[PDB]
Each structure stands twice: as C-alpha cells, then as structure tokens.
Ligand binder design. Structure first.
Ligand code: NAG
Length: 727
DNA sequence: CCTCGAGGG
C-alpha cells in the first residue's frame, strides 16, 4: 500500500532510484525482482559483505559520487572482500568518484565497469581477476590536477590480457607516459587522451588490429592561455612515427587534438581505409591545411575537426577528394576574410551538409559562395565581425546563423545567391534600422527569421513583406511620430509564430494586432498591466489575431485580469500563460470566456487561495498550473466540473493538507497531481496520506520529495519518515 | 567516439 521501496522511487524496468537521498548505508527495503539500483551521489562511505545480500539479482548498480576524493572541499571508502560477490549476475557497476585505492573483488558476470575518478593508482592482473566477460572498462582521472597523485597510475604489462572480451578501454587523465603494454587484442576502442604520452609508434599499438576508435589527444599540449592547470609538453610536438596506424584496417575514428602538431603526414592515414572521423583540433596546422596533401586519400572521411588551429587562407586542393565529407569544423582558426577561393575545394563535395565557422574574426565575407555548394544544410558564422556585403531556429532546412556579428544595417545585396535559405539568424547584432520591406529581397524562401536582441524600429507596416514564406519571426528583446509599432503583423500572410517578448512598447504602439495566420504569440516581459490600465485603448489588442492558439503573457506585471480582457482575447485560444504576474484574485468561472482553453499557466502569481469560484462547466481545461503562489486553502468541488482535467500542479504553495473534497471523482483521471514543497502538517491522523497513496502513480516524487512542514521534528522531512497511518 | 577541455561512457 505504501510504495514498496521507501525511501526510494520504483521506476518501471526493474529500476529502483535511490539517487540524492543522503543515504549512508545501502537501503534494505520482495526485493527478488529488482534488477537495477541507482545510488548516485549519496553519503555511503563503507560497504559490507552483507550489504547486497537482499539484492542477489542485481544486474546494474550505480554507486557514483558516494565518497569523493577532493573533489569538493576528503573521503576514503572501505569495501569488504565479499561485498559484490553476493551479486553473481551483476553486469554493470559504476564506482566512479569514490575514494577507493584498490579495486574490490567482483563477480565474473561483470560486463561494464567504471573506476574513473577514484584513487586506484595501480592496475595489475590481480586487480581485475576473473573479469573474462568484461567488455567495458573505464578508469579516467585518477592522477590529474583535480584528483592528484604522485607520479602516475601504473598499468603493468599484460595486466588486462585476462580481459578476453574487452572492447572498450578508457584511461584518460592518469599521467601515463606510455601506452600500456600487451593490451587485449580484442579492443575496438582505446582512449588514452590527456596523459603525458609524448611519443607514439607502431610498437605502442602492437596487435590492436581491431581498433575502431583511438584517442591519443592532449598528450603534448601547449598550455598558453589554459584556464585550468595544464602540463606543458617537453617538446615541440607529439612525436609520431609514420607507420604508427598502418595496421589499423578497421579504424573509423582517430583523434589527434591538442598534440602541438605542426605538420600533417599522409603516412599516418595511409592504412586507415574506413577513417570516417578525424579530430585535428587545437594544433598548429593553420598553414598545413592551406597546403597539405594528407587529405588526398581520406575518401571515407565523414567528419573532420580543424578547429582552433593557430599559425590569406585557402583550404588546400587536397580537400577535393573528401567525397564522403558531411561535416567540417573550422571554429577558432581566425581568418580575416571569406572569399570565393577560401573554401573553393569543398564546393563539389557531394554530401557536405554542415560547416562550422564560429569565432574566426571574419570581417569581410562573400556569402554568395554558400549558394554554390551541393548540399549545404547548415552554415554557422556566429560570433564573427561581419558588418555588411563584400567589397525558433530549428530548422534542424538550409540554415545560416549570423548571430553575434557586427551588422548595424541590413542590405539586400548581402543575401545574393542565398535565395535558398529557409532559416536565418541575425540575433545579437547591433541592427538599428527602419525595416520597411527593402532588406531581404533575395530571401524568397526564408521561413524562419531570428532578429532578437537588436535595435529595430518597427513602425513601418511594410516590414518583412519581402519575405513571402516567412512562418516564424523572433523579435525578442528589441529596443526601438509616424507609423505604428507592430502594424506590419497583419500583412505577413503566412506568419504562424511570432515573439515580441521583452520589447520597448512606446506611446504609438498599434492598439490592435491583426492576423489570420498567427497561432503562437509570445508577448512576455512587456507592460500589459500598464497597457490594460489605460482603459479601452488596448482592450482588444489581441482580438485581431484570428485563429490564435497559444498566447504568452508571462511577466507583464498583471495585477488584475478583468472579464472584459479575457472575453476579448481570440476565442480560438487553447493555451494561455500568465506565469510570473501579480494576480492575487481571479474569478475562475470567468474561464467560461475562454471556451476552447485547454492549458492555463498561472504560476508565480499570488493566488492565496483557490476559493473565489470553481472551474466552470463545461470547460475543456486539461492542464492547470498554479504552482509558486501562496495557496493556503481551496473550496470543495473546485476542480469537480473540469471533465477533461488531467494535470494540476499545486506544488510550492502553502497547503497544510490536500483534501479529496477538492477534486471529487476526477482525482482518479488525473495523470499528474504535483503537491511537492507544500508545508504539509503531518499529525498522526492526517488524511492526505491515504489520498496520495490512492493516486501514487500520478504524484511525482511522492516517495521522498513530498515533505512535512510541521510538526517541528518532521519539518523538512518526508511524510513517510514517520508512519502517519498509526494514529 | 560524443556533448557541453572536462566529462561521459
Ligand atoms: C510543478 O511546478 C513546479 C514549480 O517549480 C515545477 O518544478 C515542476 O516541474 C512541476 N511539476 C510537474 C509534474 O510538471
């Protein structure tokens, strides 16, 4: 009757969630059917032979973050010999972020193991005894600046050969000077990044002929302008032996990032015939990518990262061979100019769909080039310094992001040959301009336009009229004696979504917003309280938006909401958000003025009670959110008439109980009833317990998150800390 | 390998 696994939550697939519960011991709670137990981030510092005896059938166990090394502000975990042996079908185990110095004894059933961020500094053949079914082993971060050790962690030669089935090995951030010797040949991937492996040769990868991904990056770093502690490389560059990767016939992925690579050598990729991913970021290949020939035979290369390579830029002719290339990252390279030659050799690549060009300080750009490519779907030029022509965004659609640039004026010529663009972002520029229908002529196909965080003045009624396919327009956070603000809206014939959120609404703001197409309007963070206080002037401000379905009036300083104003909102309205206003009183029967309303959000107001009316017949209301108010009481039968009521959020209020007289029969059709963060009074007779237990599947966090506000020793603790059914 | 140089897995 009480949920079975207090103080934890039962979740469907045999999962018992005991996360973040301040537990100091493994809970005891039949348990013969639980197969998964998560105990993430509790306070368990000691583990004992008998601690898992009741969970003999566990397959998955997460003990992450129970006894962190430092860490935080220092913990050592003790584990008895037979602790995990009681679970002889245990398949997965996470011991990461625990102060253990040796790996515990484990059952041979184990398949996945994490020992990351512990204090295990030695792995020998004894450490992993009998893990012959192990496929996954992670142990990162046991000897770096956040989890320091003296010297390095040692993996002895052949220590892991017993792991006959090991496909996955990660040993990052462990101060390794060399790749461990005689690693299991079954390895399909090996991560040894961010150690001190300054030298690499075919010897170091001897017999790893089953590798699909190898990460040897960050082993020779340059620590100039490194935010966190960095160990500067002893040499000019990662020393790479030409034949190192030659035998890696199945290598699909290779990352050589942050290796201080000054040149590329085609030898490296010679034997890599299924190489689909290559990461070359954070090196010094600026000149190299401008001239090299290494790319000439990488014909299966799908993804390529060239980001943050330091010293007129032109991608080398070798790029023309990358006919499988789908994605190219060129962030943070820094080139002043983007021209017709800069990216020339990418133009005929059959399936190049994504191009990252962030943070390059580009101040002159012939964007026209992006109309010549074969299948560009996304070009990110955000955070550059583009100021003009050359001399809702999802869209996940030919898309271009020009946000955080230097546009002050938009000129139609900057968009020549970009006529195929369906999504554009000019957000976070400094565009102060009278928009008037003469800015985006070539953008004939533009459906989504983000002009947020700019300084547009929108008095002109011809605004955006040259965008015939415009469906979604974001004018959020816009800062403005002729024309009228927002007058253009009615003339945008296919506009479905519009945001005018957090704007500067001045005297001659159009008293009417009109449309036949707008279905969603975000009018958040404006002054609708101040506007509706000006009498009849704005009484019908939204009425002209025919077919309007969703309206957001959050953060509009609404202190009152008269029936006049609700009645003159479009009768089509299905969703209305009044979140974070100052509503103290509200006749709930006034909701009958919103016939088709289904979702109502009134959170962050000061409705001290649900007392003033009832949910009217025969409303179609489905979701009511009245959280973070100050509700201290509700009238019986309040929710009774809302036939279609499914979700109601009463959380973060001041309810001393939750009574069934409120809902009646509809309490059993409720999919969600959220009553957390109410100061419930947990006397020994309290009736709310049996009620919540009746709809327990439908109240989130009931097991431990629904807590008492009184009496004093129960203050801040769950309604199940003591059994309240006793009295 | 991936997401948002460290962390995840
Ligand atoms: C109820 O509202 C609270 C307000 O903070 C929110 O945290 C929670 O997500 C909501 N509950 C549900 C089930 O959506």
């Amino acid at each position: 009757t009480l949920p079975a696994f207090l103080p934890c939550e039962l979740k469907p697939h045999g999962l018992v969630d005991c996360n973040w519960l301040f537990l100091k011991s493994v809970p005891r709670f039949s348990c013969s059917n639980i197969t998964r137990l998560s105990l993430i981030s509790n306070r368990i510092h000691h583990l004992h032979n008998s601690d898992f005896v009741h969970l003999s059938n566990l397959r998955q166990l997460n003990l992450k973050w129970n006894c962190p090394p430092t860490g935080l502000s220092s913990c050592h975990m003790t584990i008895e010999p037979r602790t995990f042996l009681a679970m002889r079908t245990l398949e997965e185990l996470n011991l990461s972020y625990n102060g253990i110095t040796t790996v515990p004894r484990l059952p041979s059933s184990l398949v996945n193991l994490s020992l990351s961020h512990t204090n295990i500094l030695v792995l020998d053949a004894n450490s992993l005894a009998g893990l012959y079914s192990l496929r996954v082993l992670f142990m990162d971060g046991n000897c770096y600046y956040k989890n320091p050790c003296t010297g390095a962690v040692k993996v002895t030669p052949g220590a892991l050969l017993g792991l006959s089935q090991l496909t996955h090995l990660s040993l990052k951030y462990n101060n390794l000077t060399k790749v461990p010797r005689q690693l299991p040949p079954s390895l399909e991937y090996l991560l040894v990044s961010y150690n001190l492996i300054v030298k690499l040769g075919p010897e170091d990868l001897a017999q790893l002929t089953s590798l699909r991904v190898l990460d040897v990056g960050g082993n020779c770093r340059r620590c100039d302008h490194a935010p966190n502690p960095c160990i500067e490389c002893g040499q000019k560059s990662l020393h790479l032996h030409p034949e190192t990767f030659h035998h890696l016939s199945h290598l699909e992925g290779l990352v050589l990032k942050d290796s201080s690579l000054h040149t590329l050598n085609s030898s490296w990729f010679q034997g890599l015939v299924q190489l689909s991913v290559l990461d070359l970021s954070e090196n010094f290949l600026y000149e190299s990518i401008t001239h090299t020939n290494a790319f000439q035979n990488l014909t299966r290369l799908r993804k390529l990262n060239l980001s943050f390579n330091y010293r007129r830029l032109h991608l080398a002719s070798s790029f023309k061979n990358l006919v499988s290339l789908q994605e190219l990252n060129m962030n943070g390279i820094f080139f002043r100019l983007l021209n017709k030659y800069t990216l020339r050799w990418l133009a005929d690549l059959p399936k190049l769909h994504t191009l990252h060009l962030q943070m390059n300080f580009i101040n002159q750009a012939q964007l026209s080039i992006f109309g010549t490519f074969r299948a560009l779907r996304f070009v990110d030029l955000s955070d550059n310094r583009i100021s003009g022509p050359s001399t809702m965004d999802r869209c996940k659609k030919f898309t271009m992001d020009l946000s955080r640039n230097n546009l002050v004026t938009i000129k139609p010529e900057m968009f020549v040959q970009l006529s195929r663009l369906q999504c554009l972002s000019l957000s976070h520029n400094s565009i102060a301009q009278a928009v008037n229908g003469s800015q985006f002529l070539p953008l004939t196909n533009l459906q989504v336009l983000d002009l947020s965080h700019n300084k547009l003045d929108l008095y002109h009624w011809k605004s955006f009229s040259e965008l015939p396919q415009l469906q979604a327009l974001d004018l959020s956070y816009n800062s403005q004696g002729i024309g009228h603000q927002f007058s253009f809206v009615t003339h945008l014939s296919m506009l479905q979504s519009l945001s005018l959120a957090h704007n500067d609404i001045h005297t001659r703001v159009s008293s009417h917003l009109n449309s036949n197409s707008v279905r969603f309007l975000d009018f958040s963070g404006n002054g609708m309280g101040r506007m509706w206080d000006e009498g009849g002037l704005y009484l019908h401000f939204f009425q002209g938006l025919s077919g309007l379905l969703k309206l957001d009036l959050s953060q509009n300083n609404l202190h009152i909401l008269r029936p006049q104003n609700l009645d003159n909102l479009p009768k089509s309205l299905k969703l209305l958000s009044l979140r974070d206003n100052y509503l103290s009183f509200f006749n709930w029967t006034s909701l009958s003025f919103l016939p088709n309303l289904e979702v109502l959000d009134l959170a962050g107001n000061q409705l001290k009670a649900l007392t003033q009316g009832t949910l009217p017949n025969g409303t179609l209301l489905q979701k009511l959110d009245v959280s973070s108010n100050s509700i201290v009481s509700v009238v019986p039968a309040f929710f009774a008439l809302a036939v279609e009521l499914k979700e109601v959020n009463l959380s973060h209020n001041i309810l001393k109980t939750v009574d069934r007289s409120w809902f009646g029969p509809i309490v059993m059709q409720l999919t969600v009833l959220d009553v957390r963060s109410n100061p419930l009074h947990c006397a020994c007779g309290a009736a709310f317990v049996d009620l919540l237990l009746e709809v327990q599947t439908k109240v989130p966090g009931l097991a431990n998150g629904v807590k008492c506000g009184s009496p004093g020793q129960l203050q801040g603790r769950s309604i199940f800390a003591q059994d309240l059914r006793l009295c």
